[PDB]
């Protein structure tokens, strides 16, 4: 409610840190073999945007937990030497630094 524009801003800034759009939409098993056997709770920026515009986030805490879930799932599935794991680690750190007083 008082946080809706704040979260819209946080999402826009976090997506700017993923210019390639690798976190833009859900990862499917066709794109990533075995993904749904390893990752129990998928997340992506599109799903996060739908939750914002639906007023589904009750707090900044809840929003940060979905961002961290997204990045944690990428670091769990992908090997550390991959662009995907490296971006997830980098944007996790930077994003939380932005969103935390």
């Amino acid at each position: 409610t008082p946080i809706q524009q704040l979260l819209e801003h946080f999402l826009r800034q976090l997506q700017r840190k993923d210019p390639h759009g690798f976190f833009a939409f859900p990862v499917t098993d066709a794109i990533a073999p075995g993904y749904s056997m390893i990752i129990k709770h998928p997340m992506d920026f599109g799903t996060m945007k739908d939750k914002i515009v639906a007023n589904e986030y009750k707090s900044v805490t809840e929003f940060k937990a979905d961002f961290k879930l997204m990045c944690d799932n990428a670091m769990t599935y992908n090997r550390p030497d991959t662009v995907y794991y490296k971006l997830a680690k980098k944007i996790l750190h930077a994003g939380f630094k932005m969103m935390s007083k």
């Binding site: 390639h20 794109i31 990533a32 991959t82």
Partner: peptide, 10 residues
């Protein structure tokens, strides 16, 4: 086979 289909350079 544990990886993305593409290299993610584009």
């Amino acid at each position: 086979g544990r990886g993305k289909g593409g290299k993610g350079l584009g």
